Symmetry: D2
Subunit: 226 residues, 4 copies
């Protein structure tokens, strides 16, 4: 059992200790489509250095979670190759931005399950015993079995890493928080298409006594786990 994390705006978690038997690290969408050359985000013309800066810090947190025996869950955003799970508005916006879901680029069909751009990057590769969530939306709970995996393991606390801070990570945090999960978001293990959106996404969590949970740097988590 571990102590609290020095976090914003309260010492996390609210109940005063971290139990690996009730805590999961979530790694959200570390895929070429969100952080690598030739994928979805690169094809739209965004700066990949903003999404990639969280990769090596995430690998150090993943190693700490594995050493403490906490649950580890990974997510991949993606669609059935027949696109039966693709809403027409999501498709139309991706075409408007110059990177249509299902269209072929340097890393295969954009955001399609089984394609090279959709795979988890090797810097944070999963291992046996770490379930992978395949989500068709931004939030990892909707149209998945994530809540069943968490409730079966008795998980009450989540530590969030991955990309992007303001889209998939924030949506997943908001979904978990409404169900009563106690959530921490790591500031140096997340990133966005705009630095001001990354910073605003983190400061939004801290209002009203910690409306969505708390924020911390990975250094503050690693100090609590040591």
């Amino acid at each position: 059992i571990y102590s609290t994390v020095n976090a914003n705006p309260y010492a996390w978690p609210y109940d005063g200790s971290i139990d690996p038997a009730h805590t999961a690290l979530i790694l959200i969408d570390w895929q070429i489509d969100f952080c690598g050359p030739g994928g979805y985000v690169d094809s739209m013309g965004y700066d990949l250095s903003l999404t990639r800066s969280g990769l090596e810090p995430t690998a150090r947190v993943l190693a700490a979670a594995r050493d403490t025996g906490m649950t580890v869950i990974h997510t991949r955003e993606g669609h059935r190759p027949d696109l039966a799970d693709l809403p027409p508005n999501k498709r139309w916006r991706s075409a408007s931005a110059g990177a249509e879901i299902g269209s072929v680029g340097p890393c295969g069909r954009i955001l399609v399950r089984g394609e090279p751009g959709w795979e988890i990057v090797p810097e944070v590769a999963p291992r046996e015993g770490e379930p992978i969530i395949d989500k068709p939306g931004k939030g990892a709970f909707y149209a998945t079995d994530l809540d069943l995996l968490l409730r079966t393991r008795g998980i009450t606390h989540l530590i969030l890493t991955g990309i992007t801070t303001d889209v998939s990570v924030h949506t997943t945090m908001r979904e978990a928080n409404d169900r009563g999960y106690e959530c921490l978001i790591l500031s140096d293990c997340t990133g966005a298409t705009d630095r001001k959106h990354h910073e605003a996404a983190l400061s939004m969590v801290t209002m009203q006594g910690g409306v969505f949970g708390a924020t911390a740097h990975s250094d503050d988590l690693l100090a609590a786990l040591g």
Copy 2:
């Protein structure tokens, strides 16, 4: 009977090129004393009520336009069962830390408890018969409610969002609806937050990647479209 697109950011809304009132709902989120009035939850935490109240008059004019065109209208209230059976202990603990514990007695009764004066919808945007009210225990209006059943029964595909706050309840509801494939518009002058920088960032987040959560617009741009049949 069908209306043109809205001049919106970052695309002319909606994506399918017209607004049909038979398939469109206006959502009014949490226009309650607890979020925008003296003596409630937000006031007791020490935030500036002028930031949350400025969207009330514009919302009333959009509500009038929705009623005139025969759109669906749905209202939401955040709040808890008086026995607090729907209150997660972390939500309760943070509200106490912020100096406004849910269920504690203040100037407007028990904070965020269903049936209390602070929890009522303010009269400037009072519901009418035929405009369902959602009682939500969380920030998103879909979780632990019948909202998705009400929308699917009426054949709703498109949502127009107003209410408070931009970055918490409104954004959570927009993200939930968007993942299910609803086409959503958020009105910039009919929403507000505890911090102006968070209000502005919440709107600009919508506009990335071709409109990742939908589009943004001023109520003037919506009212112009609702005076232009095609």
Copy 3:
């Protein structure tokens, strides 16, 4: 106090070998005039109310035992918003075809509408403060409600089911809970149906494949385990 297993079909319930009141809820499903009283929905369709009412007094004895042991108690009411925004058109059409249209005026007010006399919980099993009531628009108590939030907030893992009808609202709620991993017991003498053969078949369906939906028991065997 922690209690031993219940003599149940097809295994001594529950699977994990003890009953902890801190993690167990008694659910009372739809004990309303619309399902078990004169002038309501079920009476207006022409079904025999003695089939649905026989479980009322046994349910009151189990409710007393649940309150004595400090277990969670949750009640359900099936019903609709007065504006009928939560009423699917197929559910409405079938209720009209059966001679008891939802929302139509009958001897106990508008049929299956929230706030109407026929919709109230009957006094034999009146709720107490601290026993949450679920308002469900469907047969299953989880769909379009906050039930799963109430159960997870209290740390509930085990459910004991009573109420009506065995084959419709009770079975649908049991199937929904079971898929989420809740461990469920259905009481044979505290439930009932519009047809006795459907009541008996609904109970036997639970018992297949090692207890596919949980187990069945008589209230006497639950009260024996609780030492009442």
Copy 4:
């Protein structure tokens, strides 16, 4: 291109008076060796496979008719992630009690595990590209899946149900769909159960209260309505 009602119990189905293939899906539930073939889960528990297999050839004729009319077709497989992360401990314990533990090795590989021979859809009703397959960890096809997203994206309002077993996976899926407002038909000769009395009672339960869960029909009456 729009079809008339099916002669069904207890009303001519559907309630709105016609069948539009653009808004209708045929669901094939759990036609797997684990539920209907030698060496699988149901066989290892000692139940009579002739009761679950009798609906296979009628189902194949209905699948051919659905393909000809351009209806949506959706298939389901019950089963678990190979790491068993989606397996509740009560489900596991009961399967061991019944002598067929989920994840244990039997004649067709690991019982109810995704990717194993006993878990595959049997060839008589093999899926085709553009007929989505649901992998469900529970009895109801909606819980912990993307089924509701697939149906709402296609504009589906009406469901025709086939598969096994009548009283477990088929009934649970019918009850879940009905509460959301889907209009459902269950085919009596394209379903089956571990007990014939449970099959018959599961069909009769649908028919009460003016059709509380929908209606029942024979394949013959559906194929007559489709022409």
